[PDB]
Design a protein around this ligand. Structure first.
Ligand SMILES: [Mg+2]
Ligand SMILES: [Mg+2]
Ligand SMILES: [Mg+2]
Ligand SMILES: [Mg+2]
Ligand SMILES: [Mg+2]
Ligand SMILES: [Mg+2]
Ligand SMILES: [Mg+2]
Ligand SMILES: [Mg+2]
Ligand SMILES: [Mg+2]
Ligand SMILES: [Mg+2]
Ligand SMILES: [Mg+2]
Ligand SMILES: [Mg+2]
Ligand SMILES: [Mg+2]
Ligand SMILES: [Mg+2]
Ligand SMILES: [Mg+2]
Ligand SMILES: [Mg+2]
Lengths: 172, 172, 172, 172, 172, 172
């Protein structure tokens, strides 16, 4: 029995939105782990803390954008376990930014794959929605992380990392 | 002799925009009929009146969005009779909301069909225009009507219908 | 079974209000056709566009004044097809103003005929209502269109039409 | 090698804070599931939606209070999988409030158990911290849910549930 | 060695963005030539001057939108000579507006061709970006130039051209 | 047939102004290339980006100052191809500032050479105009670039370049 709103919305698209929901929540958890790693007394970079804390809140917003979309189209949210991140510790500011870029590139591919499911099933509204909410925001996030990685390599460790935290990440 | 602006704009697309203009004007007329039905002394629901009056004005705005688009692309507006609605009377608030949802789903399909004409003829700008102006607005309208139908069934007839008119539709 | 409000309201008057509703909606559609004709890239007169767009919205307001009146007196709105206008194209600014005047004079007669139905059936309130809402507004509209026609003949075609659009119709 | 801040902070307390972090994140996920269930077109209670959405954000704040505390005391955050909730669907507003109360009572016990670990290990600051941040907030949350359950039983299903959503939960 | 941001970005798309950069800069130079032609003591139309000066600045902004896009996607800007325009002199206001429309239609085709390269290579983000930034803006620019050409033919040479400069182009 | 304004304005001066127009536009293009090089994900210096972007806009303003001057004196603007810059890549912040200084010194000589043409032909107004608009502005630009080069050598590569971008160029 099809939900009352449902029109031009395919079971593969509905299932793909649930898979993207879990990935956004997973990315939220990775950024949360990194945020609180930078609050450790033996790491102590408030800029990096604030940056990954905000990244974590944004990913949970992405998850909730997809939950609202699922309900708009008359699909049904199915939640899965949010897997713990692969590491308890995240190294230097540079190493954490590289992990961030690799995560954002994996989320980007997964969004393009979900756009392909929409396209395969003739879902013109879902393709446009993914384009409006996600595809350009992911390009912007990937360029920003690439800029940060270039600058963290330019400033180098020690004082450089500290000044990057103060200047680019507005630490404090 | 092609109009001065005309570029990548197919006769099938031009004709499809005229057909969508008439459908938007038709939907405007159905909502107008329902609006003034709720102003009857023997129906007397100001919330429902205000809701369908606004829906009617929006559909005429949709019609005028398509008239402006036709002229932008160098096509020519051709108007047809606006058929009277299928009923003089529209029953209960619940029955009118169900008629609304069925109308919005028929307008939605017709917009996806017009997007398919654009796509078939390689009209990338017209596909994006339909996506920006219509496809997401239709999804939102269909979800809102589905929410209203669920709530009108929850509150039930009599006092429930009255309180829905006061609370959700801000009657008065 | 007479509606609860109904007092001194004759079946001929009720039927005449439904006929005037359709005529107001028809006039609305003619003005809408002319409005969007003046938005064509090959006509391109923003003053004329704005003038007929406003005329169109006013005629739909007239239609809704009569719908409210029908319900006030305990009559029942019966909607008919809104016939498409007699032309797709409307010529020069002067030619469109002459079509406007001829339409307003036909709506005026039809209002005087409806006033005669009210009078024949002793409906003192309906005669006064038509006088308050319509008869003087029609005289004003006819005088304004006659003034515009005189001025469009004075300024002549080409630059004159352009300056009339800028000065009298406040184009832009 | 003990972290630089660490003083009077026992391995059992550190491990108990990580277990409470996962429970707060779990409760956050249950409230998130319930929030978006109430946004379904076939459930459509904006008050319940807003209430569980806020409850979800608060539980994630609780999780982050414990992450900050772990780092303050020189312990180390260890994250585990956030288990999916036990249900995809949550029934009536009344049924969801009862699930909420049962969850808050299980989180409450778990906080008293964590306070007992602190007490067993002579951690006077950690006992006071749990008292300041959690023990009274849990009593308040449990009393509020008990009040809501009493009122949802008083108003009854259908119109009652709708009016509770409008009046007590400020729906819209 | 692929740049750090690069994902789903094809060499044909990168090369097409460099070709569109040069075309936008070329169009900027044509509008600049026309702007300063209208500042000649023997042409002296401040409205036309201001209009083509703004058109020139906008085209250079288009060029810079594509430079930012190239860098966002991890491609590399390659600049070519900006060819001088085909004429030193641009005739009447009407003749310059017709040259403008022909230029905007050639830039429009070139944007649709670049969208086709994006589409051929499955670049969903680049297609949406071209749609958001360019395809509708080009339709609007072409309709405006078509409107101006219609009006410059309506007003005729001499006084008409002067009044068009004062009224539509706000000369001074 | 001499233009109506022309007085004491020599063909050599008119031709020299057209040559300076092309040089200013060339310098604009070099600064634009350098601006967008500093926006590359693998260069990523917002201060340098903003500095060369502004330098580029100023050089195009210089070009337009000379176009206005040509028309004031009754000469005729003749535009040539704007040659692409000699490099796609511009190295370190220090290397780009040295390229800037060398460009500004070549533009300076070319302005003194144009002043000599004015002087040779007794054009007292054109000599004063070049003095007022250009000769002191070039001295100021050359001193500023020399100061920046001294400071980029003082701070050294890596962190020094980053801090120069933040402090002297107000990056962000
Ligand atoms: Mg995300
Ligand atoms: Mg794809
Ligand atoms: Mg699209
Ligand atoms: Mg868009
Ligand atoms: Mg519509
Ligand atoms: Mg389709
Ligand atoms: Mg009327
Ligand atoms: Mg009479
Ligand atoms: Mg009176
Ligand atoms: Mg909690
Ligand atoms: Mg105890
Ligand atoms: Mg352009
Ligand atoms: Mg195409
Ligand atoms: Mg210069
Ligand atoms: Mg000298
Ligand atoms: Mg001097």
């Amino acid at each position: 029995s099809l939900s009352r709103p449902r029109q031009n919305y395919h079971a593969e698209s509905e299932s793909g939105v649930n898979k993207q929901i879990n990935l956004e929540l997973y990315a939220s958890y990775v950024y949360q782990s990194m945020a609180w790693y930078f609050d450790r007394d033996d790491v102590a970079l408030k800029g990096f803390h604030k940056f990954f804390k905000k990244a974590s809140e944004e990913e949970r917003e992405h998850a909730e954008k997809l939950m609202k979309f699922q309900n708009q189209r008359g699909g049904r949210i199915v939640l899965s376990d949010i897997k713990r991140p692969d590491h308890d510790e995240w190294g230097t500011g540079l190493e954490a930014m590289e992990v961030a870029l690799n995560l954002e590139k994996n989320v980007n591919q997964s969004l393009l794959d979900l756009h392909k499911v929409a396209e395969k099933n003739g879902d013109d509204q879902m393709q446009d929605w993914i384009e409006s909410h996600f595809l350009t925001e992911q390009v912007e996030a990937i360029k920003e992380l690439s800029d940060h990685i270039t600058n963290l390599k330019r400033v180098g460790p020690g004082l450089g990392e500290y000044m990057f935290d103060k200047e680019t990440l507005d630490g404090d």
